[PDB]
Write a protein that binds this ligand. Sequence first.
Ligand SMILES: Cc1cc2nc3c(=O)[nH]c(=O)nc-3n(C[C@H](O)[C@H](O)[C@H](O)COP(=O)(O)OP(=O)(O)OC[C@H]3O[C@@H](n4cnc5c(N)ncnc54)[C@H](O)[C@@H]3O)c2cc1C
Ligand code: FES
Lengths: 297, 96
Amino acid sequence: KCSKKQEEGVVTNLYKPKEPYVGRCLLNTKITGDDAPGETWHMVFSTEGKIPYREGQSIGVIADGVDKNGKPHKVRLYSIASSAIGDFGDSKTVSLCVKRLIYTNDAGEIVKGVCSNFLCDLQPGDNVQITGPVGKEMLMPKDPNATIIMLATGTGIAPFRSFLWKMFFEKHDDYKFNGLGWLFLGVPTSSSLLYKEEFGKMKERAPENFRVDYAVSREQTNAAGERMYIQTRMAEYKEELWELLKKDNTYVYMCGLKGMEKGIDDIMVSLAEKDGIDWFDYKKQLKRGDQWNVEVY
Amino acid sequence: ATYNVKLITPEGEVELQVPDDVYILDQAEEDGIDLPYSCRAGSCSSCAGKVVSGSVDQSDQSYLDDGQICDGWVLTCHAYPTSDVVIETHKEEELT
Ligand SMILES: Cc1cc2nc3c(=O)[nH]c(=O)nc-3n(C[C@H](O)[C@H](O)[C@H](O)COP(=O)(O)OP(=O)(O)OC[C@H]3O[C@@H](n4cnc5c(N)ncnc54)[C@H](O)[C@@H]3O)c2cc1C
Ligand code: FES
C-alpha cells in the first residue's frame, strides 16, 4: 500500500530500551508564565546527527533512577518538537515539549510524574538516555499543496511545531509548501499559550498560507456564553471546515490530551447528518485515506 | 508459480491461469481473449485496466506515475502476477 504521507527515509526503533543513546541537555526553558496552572518546559538535546528523525515522530525517555524492584523506569514518549533539522538547523539536535505532571489526590498528597519531572528538572550538561525514533502515525503529507488541519491541546502542539518549522521557517530544495496550514490550539490560560510569538512570526511571513486559532478555555466564551474549548473555536468555522472535509488534499491531524476528540466528534456529528451522513463511517473513510490522524495521551 | 486471474471485460467475466514469469496480456491472447493494446512495451495507455484485488509486478512499465499505481491502475502488456488477481480491462477511456 502506498501512503499519502512521506514514508521515504523514515527510520524506526534505531535505539531501544535495552541500548539507549545517551545524549545531553543543552537548553531547558520554562515557556509557561508563573501564574500558569501546570508548568511546561521546552528542551533540546544533543544527538550527534545519530537520530535522523522526521517531522511528527516522538521519542522515548528513560528517567534516571530505578523502580521499587531495582529495575529502570518505563519508557515515556514525547512528541518531537523540533523539525528534522533541529532548532539550530544543523540536524544534531532534538527538541521536546514537556509539561510537569503534578496533581494533588483526595488525601491532600502532592503526586509528581516520574519522567515529566525528571525532564523539566534537567540542567545544561545532564545526560539523557534516548529511545526511538518512534511513530509513523503522524508523518507529514506528501502533498506540498496540502490543506493541513492541526488540532492540538497542550503538549500536543509539539509535532505541529515540528511541522511548521519545516514549512515556514526552512528552505528545502525538495520541499516547498504552498497549501494552507490551519492550526487550532486549545489551552487553559493565556499563560499556558505555548510558542505564540513564533506562530506570530510565521503568520507574519506567510499570511495566506498560515491560519491560526487559539482557544483559551478560562478566558474566552462564545456568543452562546460557554467556555472556549478547541471544539468551540472550531465550531466557529464549522462551514469551511466541513467543506474542506470533502477535498482530496485536506489532511487532519489531532494531537494532545485524551478526551479532546469526544468534544470534536460531537461537533462533527451534527455537521454530518446535515448532508444525511453518518460521521464515524465518514471518519473511518478519511482514516483509510490517511486523511485523519490521531495521537492522544 | 501460476495464479488465478479473473478478467472483467466490457463483455463479461472470464478466468485463466497465468505463470508469474509471463505477462498477463500475453496469456489472454493465446487463451483467445481480445484485450486492447498498442505498444506492448508498457509506455502507452491502450491495455489499461484497474486492479480490484490481488497484486502485480509491473516493474518495467514507464507510462504511469505513482499516484496512478497507487490508484491500482495497471498496464496489462507489462504486468506479471505475484498473486491471484481480479482485473477490469478496456479502461483506457476511464484513464483518458
Ligand atoms: C504518543 C504520545 C505522545 C506524548 N507526547 C507528550 C508531550 O508532547 N508532552 C507531554 O508532556 N507528555 C506527552 N505524553 C505523555 C508522556 O509520555 C508522559 O506520560 C507524561 O508526560 C507524564 O509522565 P510522568 O512519567 O511524568 O508521569 P508518570 O510517572 O507516568 O505518572 C502517571 C501515572 O499517574 C496517573 N496519572 C497520570 N496523569 C494523571 C492526572 N492528570 N490525574 C490523576 N492521575 C494521573 C496515571 O494512571 C499514570 O499511571 C505523550 C504520550 C504518548 C503516548
Ligand atoms: S499497450 Fe502500450 S503499454 Fe500496454
